[PDB]
Amino acid sequence: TPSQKVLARQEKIKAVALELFLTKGYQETSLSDIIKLSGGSYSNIYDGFKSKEGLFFEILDDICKKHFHLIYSKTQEIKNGTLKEILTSFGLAFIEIFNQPEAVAFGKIIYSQVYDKDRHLANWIENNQQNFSYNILMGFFKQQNNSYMKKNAEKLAVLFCTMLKEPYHHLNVLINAPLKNKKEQKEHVEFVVNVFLNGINS
Amino acid sequence: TPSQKVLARQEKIKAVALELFLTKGYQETSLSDIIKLSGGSYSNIYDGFKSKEGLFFEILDDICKKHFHLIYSKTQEIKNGTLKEILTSFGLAFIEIFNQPEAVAFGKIIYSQVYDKDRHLANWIENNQQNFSYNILMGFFKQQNNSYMKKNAEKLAVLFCTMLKEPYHHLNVLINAPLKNKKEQKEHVEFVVNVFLNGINS
């Protein structure tokens, strides 16, 4: 199929771009480096492919796609679980994802574009909001028969993700702070989930 | 006094460096730009002054100094306040600080050094840990007659700061997301403080 061939060609460009970002560095690599090693599989493929910035985000697209399904799965298959159980389910999958060297390596690439005048990053977030994981949590919240939970559902989703993620991913990215091993991951999830549901007065 | 003169000279270099970072851009400005406009007030002042990186952190030093005292004040003068009251006191001062364009402008400078091979940033955090604000919260926690609060005091301090700060400062920095106006600041503090103390089951 001509369509399959196109997709295959696209997966080729991105795989090259990725290997360069990883091998040579994001800042070091120009589009042309990408076109050269993509050989006759480019010519001009240009839709998210006009710049190395677009390619990175086309790649990040895929990664976030795979992140969602994967978190949705540990979630989808739970037996009428309590809030606690779906909360710690999501948590484990979420936190494991952000303690992979890949989370950090892409993290660094994003942080480095802080002075991008082209603003590819703003567009990406502005136009990929539906594909973020917290929409899963936000979804379970509105299901709950709690007016507080239902009216604050989005803010709560973001708040819980942050609690699990936050000082830590940021320190990983900026100064290469060590990742959490699964034991630590589990610990922190229980910890956060408890404060979150029950608060510290107890 | 010769010492006063030295300090004055130092405040001159940093004030120049700051104006350049703000006016010309951090990445755009080299040490020499700083030395030229500092005129005869440099020659080689070199202790945190050997690089533009050192100057930035010498400046950040001062800013974090002023941030601490200021937060300590809204805190220090409270009448045997409940955890709630010192929590919302700290919160307001903390969150107001991070919704100033200055927080964001320095935020951008830090994020941009993600590929700094000299690692000035790691040293700065590694060697300025005592001067961070959460040490204030960590301090009130250990005072509380709660074994949970006292044994987790540090993790709780960091956790509360994060809840107030986190998706938001990060989005401010990377994509220039809008700041919170004081009304929104207050709202978010009450919100966070409540989940934090009482959890969402209620």
Ligand SMILES: C[C@H](CCC(=O)O)[C@H]1CC[C@H]2[C@@H]3[C@H](O)C[C@@H]4C[C@H](O)CC[C@]4(C)[C@H]3C[C@H](O)[C@]12C
């Ligand atoms: C918290 C909120 C979205 C909640 C979430 O993590 O799903 C904000 C905070 C930082 C933003 C994130 C990052 O700066 C970019 C990240 C890329 C990751 O692989 C997933 C999305 C990603 C993490 C972004 C999604 C979303 O805009 C983030 C995560």
Ligand SMILES: C[C@H](CCC(=O)O)[C@H]1CC[C@H]2[C@@H]3[C@H](O)C[C@@H]4C[C@H](O)CC[C@]4(C)[C@H]3C[C@H](O)[C@]12C
């Ligand atoms: C949360 C924890 C420290 C808690 C705190 O904010 O006081 C971590 C997260 C991000 C780190 C911070 C930033 O990347 C650098 C920030 C500079 C700010 O003006 C104050 C400290 C500052 C904010 C850093 C202090 C500390 O290492 C931070 C804040």
